[PDB]
Design a protein around this ligand. Structure first.
Ligand SMILES: NC(=O)c1ccc[n+]([C@@H]2O[C@H](COP(=O)([O-])OP(=O)(O)OC[C@H]3O[C@@H](n4cnc5c(N)ncnc54)[C@H](O)[C@@H]3O)[C@@H](O)[C@H]2O)c1
Ligand SMILES: NC(=O)c1ccc[n+]([C@@H]2O[C@H](COP(=O)([O-])OP(=O)(O)OC[C@H]3O[C@@H](n4cnc5c(N)ncnc54)[C@H](O)[C@@H]3O)[C@@H](O)[C@H]2O)c1
Ligand SMILES: Nc1ncnc2c1ncn2[C@@H]1O[C@H](COP(=O)(O)O)[C@@H](O)[C@H]1O
Ligand SMILES: Nc1ncnc2c1ncn2[C@@H]1O[C@H](COP(=O)(O)O)[C@@H](O)[C@H]1O
Lengths: 138, 136
């Protein structure tokens, strides 16, 4: 088994950086920040406690299709509150099952109740093939 | 495991491809993605593959550019240079492509004929679909 710890150590710097917004932030500001960092999710924090999680999938489904403006809508209105998480001990296979079964591409990592990072379906796919050999022609 | 097997694994053997035209409005693309529970649409120019548009394009190229989805065409935000695979190819190859090129969707062509579409989630499922897990 390859672990969540190992996935984070591979991440740049060294998975320690979690990009974040508060519940009161405008959705528009969430979307601008995602764009600035090249990411598709933000952990929603209200002063150190995990409030929820908001992603590009949330923005595509719950704003303009609901007659809302990202500028006049707050993150809380579209985020998922019941956040599923993993611990650094868990295997990538377990993580992939969770993502598949619950239809989510992001998993915060809590260690003893401390948020230590965040992993995504992309980090998991990379670990599956990262050491395999390919050709440009293949 | 092959792309063909990934397609076979899907409910209608992956025969359905949810599609839009280059002239359609982004809002109609977005509406349709919601309607069908998906994150991408193949963009057709009346029977030829013109591009691909995903929830990521929508997140990046519309309101952040002062545009409205009712007032913007799919062509404006789509990716015109589409990468694809054929059924012969292995899931590892598809995973590498998605990782290296930062895309989560691959149309599947067979002899220049579109047969279906696979996503990063189809690949991840194949990796663990046979594996045993407990709730605990
Ligand atoms: N070449 C690579 O190193 C690499 C790594 C990861 C993903 N990818 C690919 O790029 C695309 C990335 O999308 P994804 O589907 O994994 O989702 P994503 O775009 O949300 O994730 C991209 C990277 O940013 C990180 N990230 C996302 N949200 C974060 C947050 N709030 N705080 C801190 N870090 C965060 C992820 O852990 C991941 O490493 C996919 O096509 C995937 O295959 C490539
Ligand atoms: N339980 C399952 O069987 C299952 C299967 C696939 C994905 N997932 C999960 O659900 C989420 C789905 O996201 P995703 O990131 O793979 O992207 P997605 O939301 O675009 O894909 C969802 C499913 O719809 C299909 N699809 C998407 N666009 C299509 C189009 N234009 N035409 C035809 N089919 C299309 C995909 O191939 C995939 O099977 C992820 O968390 C993933 O892990 C679960
Ligand atoms: N760790 C998580 N726990 C619970 N829900 C999540 C998590 N990550 C994402 N989601 C939600 O699941 C949906 C898809 O997210 P994603 O596939 O990560 O874009 C969105 O409605 C998200 O808010
Ligand atoms: N098969 C593909 N070929 C080329 N570009 C793609 C492909 N799939 C998605 N993209 C683009 O890559 C970015 C991320 O897409 P996705 O991860 O599939 O949401 C978006 O700008 C898409 O338009």
């Amino acid at each position: 088994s390859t672990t969540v710890a190992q996935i984070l150590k591979a991440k740049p710097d060294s998975g320690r950086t979690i990009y974040t917004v508060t519940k009161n932030d405008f959705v528009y500001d969430a979307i601008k920040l995602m764009a600035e960092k090249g990411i598709g999710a933000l952990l929603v924090v209200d002063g150190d406690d995990i409030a929820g999680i908001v992603t590009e999938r949330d923005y595509a489904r719950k704003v303009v299709l609901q007659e809302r403006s990202s500028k006049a809508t707050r993150v809380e209105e579209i985020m998922t509150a019941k956040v599923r998480y993993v611990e650094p001990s868990q295997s990538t296979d377990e993580c992939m099952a969770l993502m598949t079964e619950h239809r989510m591409r992001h998993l915060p990592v809590l260690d003893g109740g401390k948020l230590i990072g965040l992993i995504s379906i992309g980090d998991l796919v990379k670990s599956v093939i990262a050491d395999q050999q390919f050709t440009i022609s293949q």
